[PDB]
């Protein structure tokens, strides 16, 4: 064989170009920097009203409004300062696994097992919430709707491919293929020109939303990657597996920066977020809890413990003023 | 309180939204959500005919004051088992495996590994699993081909119909690691009339009344 030999030596000697220029681990440099202690965060607001498991949640762009999508076919937009429900949207299919908020507060996209990413319009002239556009064209279940503008949305799916749509016409504009299993998550970059996606084949990959380019791949886990987010400056990102490992990869250094596991942990990570300074890597877990890892020393600097079921969604605001968590016991709790 | 003239109306809107949410959660809790599963080429366009009549495929029928929604397996393709955690809180898992499963050609290792998988999954090991062995048109005409040494080394004796059916039942209970929570409801019938709906009406009202007992804390 010839191309197999060339691809084998390509992967091994590009990994050798990574290893020979690999200087040191992150903790080797940041070891002398002092810790942050115990971040005892308290439940300020408890948002009740859902009557089933809560699967995903997205903050508003003004750090005050929330969407939460539940299993009983309800999408609720919360005013998170007075714990008031701004909107309640009855979905068509109650098998909703993800939801998103527009960065202008106008639209809201939500989807799931019926392979259709619905996009709803809140700021109407009639005072209800009508379905603006149902993006159909996926052949399996949907995850991580993520709004770019009011006319442009990325959606991951179980079709081993993600898709950049176009809400005006309604057709799948760009198609990102390259995974070998269900793609469970994606997270938009803060400059809204890149994204990363993690899939069930124990891998993530960094894609460009402009060219449809498979720019980078990222391995290191043993199991599926369940959720994903970016470091808030858009140069690193942390994934969470069912390996009970959160991992921080750098987009430029092409390997994992550092691992965020503890030996006492039994079960795997369901959600991952970040604080606004990029210091508190939060992580919701499958037992009951959330853990607030100090993102430079990998020490659990606090445990958010309410949540009589498994935590399913995390979100930190644009200013960093709160952490909303949501779990299968139908309660979002806000932690400050 | 210290609310303005518009915050009181925002609070009134939020309370009305709460009212609508729980008055439809009443109906969303008083409806029978049945997951539906089966093996490869088992026959499913003959029991969905029997009831009172892409992504997930949902089938409605209202039978004897009970609104049955049935969510089928014939919509999804990904067997990574990532769609199973959405299906907790279902009333029953209507499983359909027939006796002609070894026609399309080993069923033993894959079937018992799937059942050890759902007895490994924490979600399906506490939910009731209704079983159907429905027809009597070909269940007797293919047992008498030969002894069952070709794919099934668990048994090496004489193979009649109903004694081997009881043997399949007894090895099906051998698949269960813990019968302390889940409860199997097997059915050996003639799929001729609405006898097939009276083992998903009775075998699900038993689960309804068991959940009502253990939500009273009574038994």
């Amino acid at each position: 064989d010839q191309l197999r030999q060339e691809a084998e030596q390509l992967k091994n000697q590009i990994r050798d170009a990574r290893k020979a220029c690999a200087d040191a681990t992150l903790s080797q440099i940041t070891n002398n920097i002092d810790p942050v202690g115990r971040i005892q965060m308290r439940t300020r607001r408890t948002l009740r009203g859902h009557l089933a498991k809560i699967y995903a949640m997205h903050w508003g762009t003004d750090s005050r409004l929330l969407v939460s999508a539940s299993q009983d076919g309800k999408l609720i937009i919360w005013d998170s300062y007075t714990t008031n429900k701004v909107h309640a949207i009855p979905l068509r299919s109650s098998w909703v696994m993800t939801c998103a908020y527009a960065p202008s507060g106008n639209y809201v996209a939500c989807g799931g097992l019926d392979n259709i990413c619905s996009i709803y319009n809140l700021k109407t002239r009639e005072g209800n919430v009508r379905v603006s556009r149902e993006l159909a064209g996926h052949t399996g279940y949907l995850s991580c709707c993520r709004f770019l503008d009011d006319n442009q949305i990325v959606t991951s799916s179980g079709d081993t491919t993600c898709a950049l749509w176009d809400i005006e016409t309604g057709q799948q504009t760009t198609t990102f293929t390259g995974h070998t299993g269900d793609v469970m998550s994606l997270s938009l970059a803060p400059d809204t020109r890149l994204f990363v996606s993690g899939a069930c084949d124990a891998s993530a990959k960094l894609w460009d939303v402009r060219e449809g380019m498979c720019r980078q791949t990222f391995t290191g886990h043993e199991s599926d990657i369940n959720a994903i987010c970016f470091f808030p400056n858009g140069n690193a990102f942390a994934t969470g597996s069912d390996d009970a490992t959160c991992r921080l990869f750098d987009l430029r250094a092409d390997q994992e920066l550092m691992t965020y596991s503890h030996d006492n942990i039994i079960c795997g990570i369901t959600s991952v977020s970040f604080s606004k300074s990029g210091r508190l890597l939060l992580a919701g877990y499958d037992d009951f809890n959330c853990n607030v890892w100090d993102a430079l020393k990998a020490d659990r600097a606090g445990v958010l413990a309410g949540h009589d079921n498994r935590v399913s969604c995390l979100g930190v605001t644009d200013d960093g003023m709160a952490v909303a968590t949501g779990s299968w016991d139908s309660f979002l709790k806000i932690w400050n | 309180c210290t609310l303005s003239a518009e915050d009181k109306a925002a609070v009134e809107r939020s309370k009305m939204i709460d009212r609508n949410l729980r008055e439809d959660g009443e109906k969303a809790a008083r409806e029978v959500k049945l997951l539906l599963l089966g093996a490869g080429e088992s026959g499913k366009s003959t029991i969905v005919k029997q009831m009172k009549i892409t992504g997930i495929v949902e089938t409605h029928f209202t039978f004897k004051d009970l609104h049955f929604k049935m969510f089928d397996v014939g919509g999804q393709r990904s067997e990574r088992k990532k769609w199973i955690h959405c299906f907790e809180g279902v009333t029953a898992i209507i499983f359909c495996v027939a006796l002609s499963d070894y026609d399309l050609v080993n069923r033993m290792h894959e079937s018992m590994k799937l059942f050890d998988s759902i007895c490994n999954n924490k979600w399906f090991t506490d939910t009731s699993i209704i079983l159907f062995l429905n027809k009597k048109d070909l269940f007797e005409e293919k047992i008498k081909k030969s002894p069952l040494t070709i794919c099934y080394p668990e048994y090496a004796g004489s193979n009649t119909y109903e004694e081997a059916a009881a043997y399949i039942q007894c090895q099906f209970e051998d698949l269960n690691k813990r019968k302390d929570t889940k409860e199997i409801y097997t059915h050996f019938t003639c799929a001729t009339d609405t006898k097939n709906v009276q083992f998903v009406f009775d075998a699900v009202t038993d689960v309804i009344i068991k959940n009502n007992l253990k939500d009273c804390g009574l038994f």
Partner: single-chain antibody
Amino acid sequence: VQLVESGGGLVQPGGSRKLSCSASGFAFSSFGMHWVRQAPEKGLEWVAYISSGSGTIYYADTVKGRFTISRDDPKNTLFLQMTSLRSEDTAMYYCVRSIYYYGSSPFDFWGQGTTLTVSSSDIVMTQATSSVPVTPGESVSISCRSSKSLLHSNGNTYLYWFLQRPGQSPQLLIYRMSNLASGVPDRFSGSGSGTAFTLTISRLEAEDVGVYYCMQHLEYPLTFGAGTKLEL
């Protein structure tokens, strides 16, 4: 969206009348409804309010207990039943929708109004003039003053700038201080603090003339300004 009222006409004193506000084009069961009135060549005056689901009902203290408010939600018809009518109840009555959540524009669409003619503590808001002459192309500033500080502890300053072109119904321009309404031209702007509130109109076109108004929410009853009329 089309709010349209019916029930106007001439009545003698001592009688009792009823107005209907038929809505066509929106979700009437999700909107609170104000009744506003306007005396001939004097100015606006708020009358009554009913929230969504008929729970909260407020009136103005002039006719509190003398009017009543009715509502039909699966028929979209809003009623005001007036019990006794003096020579001050004669007005053009408007039927205004209002939705209250975080970020709404709660005096957005005004109905067409209906004429009713009868034969023969509270916050005071003061507007400075009654006629200002100007030509197009000239940026104009209007101002009005309030009794209390309208700046609540939330941060919201519950002041509303409306415009009534001659022969028309009013139209929301500014709903708290610096928030433009739904699809008004973006040459308008509002500013001020606490008690002094100014509306600046740059690049003034021809159809921007008409009687301007400033209103406070903050507390019931709602009180309108006197009404500055831009002249050309």
